[PDB]
RNA sequence: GGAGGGGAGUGAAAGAGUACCUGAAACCGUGCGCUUACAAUCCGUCAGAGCCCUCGACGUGUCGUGGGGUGAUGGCGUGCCU
RNA sequence: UCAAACUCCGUGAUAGCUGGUUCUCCCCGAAAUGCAUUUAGGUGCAGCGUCGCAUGUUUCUUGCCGGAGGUAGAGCUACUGG
RNA sequence: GGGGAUAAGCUCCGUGCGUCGAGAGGGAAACAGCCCAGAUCGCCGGCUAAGGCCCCUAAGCGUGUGCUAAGUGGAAAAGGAU
RNA sequence: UUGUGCGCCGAUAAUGUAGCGGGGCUCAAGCACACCGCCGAAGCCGCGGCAGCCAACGUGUUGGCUGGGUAGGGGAGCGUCCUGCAUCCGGUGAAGCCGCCGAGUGAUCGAGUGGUGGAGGGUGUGGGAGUGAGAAUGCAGGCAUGAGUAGCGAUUAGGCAAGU
């Protein structure tokens, strides 16, 4: 009994107490929010039609928000002389799906 | 001619490590009363008393 | 994160395909896809979980238009003016299942993973093979509509 | 001889739509 | 004001070293040939992470076309389908039913089988 | 035989012993963990099985918004400066 | 060491010549053309870059309108020739 | 367009022509100058361009009507040929 | 006989097939015309982070366009040393060196902490620089690869017993 959910522009197959880290939202940690679905699975049958799916929604409460590994780019190209150096940490956000 | 290049850590060690000694084979003998160990070549002289043991 | 085969996760099974009156450049494909584990949807490239494919009957696969006696198998020993070429009409009457395992083993990748792969292709001459203790699935060429 | 040949001919090629640098 | 250009040469010396550890041979001993690698490292990196997007789109091909041909349909007939059908589960999802539960997968074969055209060979 | 060293002492310290403050890097060993004798490798990078160590929660070992070390195998990949 | 010895000094000789010039990011971003040159692998001015000030679409694209050519083509009892 | 032998990966010109130079990514097996397209960073989401969809290799041993017997496809001339 | 679509011969080099990338294909996986999908990049879209130019209003947020780059022009910064002034740490252990755990968009940071150490350091704001090396067949010192390899310097020649 699981689902698909839309978050971020990408889909995440949750089910009930799984942990997801999805891209950065606007909810304060230990808020809770609510997600679209892209299908349901229940037993042995499927929710696919887009006329279902719109009537249920996935809820979950966010539980911190962290930081991204740590990306090191050194772009060079030789007989040139041509470096730049720049970091990068994505925020994120994570999760802990609770109903559906 | 020269070497052309400085040969690596992994090539030099594995031709190094064929530059070793075989330890002898040693038998017991009894010289004296007490026991030494004296290699089999040289058996036969060391109950003579030919052979110097330290 | 995307499902990956852990220890003991893969299978085998044991097919065998009737090469007689097969073209042997669709026999070949059929039966590189199958060793190589393409038809499984557990599908990794650096896992093998190809099964084991027998073929039988190799002498009688058929090789369309003027091959039989104008292509030739090529192998050369290293030593000077050392390439010494056979026909395939020559290849088959000495040695009939060497025309399938090459054109099968061209087929497959050519790194170490290939190599490991062609340990799980046997494949005979005659009609019969003694693989029978392992139950071979007998197989067949078809083709998925669409 | 055979090599000039060879060259002119592949940029006869789809992908290079009859046109390769250095003739 | 003469200034000894250790403390603030040395610096930079340990950041490739101890980040090129690992390294088989020269690479991991000497700043000049570790610095080099670093170069390389640093650019092998960037180009993979973007060819990795790439590469794992690919792996969850090859698993719905496994699938899928075990169903009796093919991919792209299977895609042409679940696009008409409505259904917009991604191919990373798709690839993990095809695995894990078997039994949804063909709930979603025969909706795609559905929705597709009579005759797909039609000029419509 | 000496050189040198081990006890015992001086010393706050002998990781201050007249080769002596602090004691880095190249270079040279010793011990331990992983890996390697069918294999074409600008020596990395992205996936990644297995083994070993660690931090938590739950029993005998089994998972996790985990951390480390090795890496079988697949994909990609033509040194730096002038 | 000899088609004009060695050492010090002028002296840090001078080279339209070869080499070298060390930390980071952000924005913009060319040329290999013209004229002249004891000149052609140099340089000066112009052309193309950037920064500041001034002027504001004057730049550019499309439609329409007014222009002058002498190429492609064609023609030869229309000229000069064949 | 000139020079050349209407040869050169030749040489000298013109072009609000392109690209490389000073440019990564996809294609052409590999292959600065050809074709698609200009990289602010991250993502284990989606649609396409050139090019492809039997296996290597991603996606069609795709559907309809024909043609080829030469592996033509997967190099070439005057010319020969029921 | 005429015009056409595909073909045949002409065909022909020197390490090894070698004028499809390979296997293989005419049971086309070849060619021509129509039709149907799909794969495909750092292109376009989705979600998030940053920066430049401009605008809207505001006592710095939002929005829109833009962000490949060598020679080169402009702006802003990290690190080191010496000093004015003001402050704080240090034999209850500074600097330096070796680690663990982390941090920043970059040079880099750690008044976060373990080990070695034994006497000076940090910070704010100004001043001044012998202030940043990977390369000049660059200079000095230490140490590698070749390598336990070549050699051990004539044309005479050494041997045995005993001793220390």
Redesign the pocket.
């Given at each position: 009994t699981y689902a698909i959910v839309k978050?971020?522009?990408?889909?995440y197959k949750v089910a009930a107490g799984?942990?997801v880290?999805v891209?950065?939202?606007?909810s304060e940690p230990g808020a809770s929010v609510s997600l679209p679905v892209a299908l349901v699975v229940d037993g042995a049958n499927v929710t696919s039609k887009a006329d279902d799916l719109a009537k249920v929604a996935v809820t979950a409460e966010v539980?911190?928000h962290?930081?991204?590994?740590?990306?090191?780019?050194?772009?060079?190209?030789?007989?040139?002389?041509?470096?730049?150096?720049?970091?990068?940490?994505?925020?994120l956000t994570?999760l802990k799906v609770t109903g559906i | 001619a020269?070497?052309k290049?400085?040969?690596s850590?992994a090539?030099?060690?594995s031709?190094?490590a064929?530059?070793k000694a075989e330890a002898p084979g040693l038998v017991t003998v009894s010289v004296a009363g007490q026991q030494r160990k004296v290699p089999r070549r040289l058996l036969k002289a060391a109950r003579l008393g030919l052979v110097d043991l330290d | 994160?995307?499902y990956?085969?852990?220890?003991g996760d893969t299978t085998r099974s044991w097919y065998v395909i009737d090469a007689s009156?097969?073209?042997?450049?669709?026999l070949?494909?059929?039966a590189?896809?199958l060793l190589?584990g393409?038809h499984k949807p557990t599908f990794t490239?650096?896992?093998?979980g190809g099964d084991f494919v027998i073929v039988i009957n190799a002498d009688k696969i058929?090789?369309?238009?003027?091959?039989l006696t104008?292509?030739?198998?090529?192998?050369?020993s290293?030593?000077?003016?050392?390439?010494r070429?056979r026909t395939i009409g020559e290849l088959l009457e000495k040695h009939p299942t060497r025309?399938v395992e090459?054109?099968?083993?061209?087929?497959?990748?050519?790194?170490?993973?290939?190599?490991?792969i062609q340990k799980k292709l046997k494949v005979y001459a005659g009609p019969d093979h003694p693989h029978a203790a392992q139950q071979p699935i007998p197989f067949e060429?078809?083709?998925?509509?669409? | 001889?055979?090599?000039?040949?060879?060259?002119?001919?592949?940029?006869h090629?789809?992908?290079?739509?009859?046109?390769?640098?250095?003739? | 004001?003469?200034?000894?250009?250790?403390?603030?040469?040395?610096?930079?010396?340990?950041?490739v070293l101890?980040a090129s550890?690992?390294?088989?041979?020269?690479?991991?001993?000497?700043?000049?040939?570790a610095?080099?690698?670093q170069?390389?490292?640093?650019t092998?990196?960037?180009?993979?992470?973007?060819?990795?997007?790439?590469?794992?789109?690919?792996?969850?091909?090859?698993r719905?076309?496994?699938a899928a041909?075990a169903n009796d349909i093919?991919?792209?007939?299977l895609?042409?389908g679940l696009?008409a059908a409505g259904v917009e589960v991604?191919?990373?999802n798709?690839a993990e039913l095809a695995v894990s539960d078997p039994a949804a997968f063909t709930a979603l074969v025969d909706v795609a089988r559905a929705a597709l055209?009579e005759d797909?060979?039609?000029?419509?």
């Open positions: 978050t971020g522009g990408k889909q799984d942990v880290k891209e950065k939202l606007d539980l911190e962290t930081k991204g590994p740590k990306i090191r780019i050194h772009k060079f190209k030789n007989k040139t002389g041509y470096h730049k150096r720049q970091g990068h940490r994505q925020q994570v | 020269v070497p290049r400085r040969m850590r090539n030099t060690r031709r190094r064929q530059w | 994160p995307t990956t085969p852990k220890a009156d097969v073209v042997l450049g669709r070949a494909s059929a590189a896809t190589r393409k490239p650096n896992v093998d058929a090789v369309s238009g003027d091959k104008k292509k030739f198998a090529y192998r050369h290293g030593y000077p003016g050392g390439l070429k025309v090459n054109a099968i083993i061209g087929m497959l990748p050519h790194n170490k993973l290939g190599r490991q060429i078809k083709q998925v509509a669409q | 001889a055979k090599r000039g040949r060879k060259k002119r001919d592949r940029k090629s789809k992908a290079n739509h009859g046109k390769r640098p250095n003739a | 004001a003469r200034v000894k250009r250790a403390l603030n040469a040395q610096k930079k010396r340990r950041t101890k550890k690992g390294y088989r041979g020269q690479r991991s001993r000497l700043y000049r040939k610095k080099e690698q170069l390389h490292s640093l092998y990196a960037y180009r993979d992470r973007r060819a990795r997007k790439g590469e794992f789109r690919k792996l969850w091909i090859s719905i076309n496994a041909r093919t991919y792209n007939r895609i042409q696009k991604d191919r990373k798709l055209p797909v060979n039609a000029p419509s």
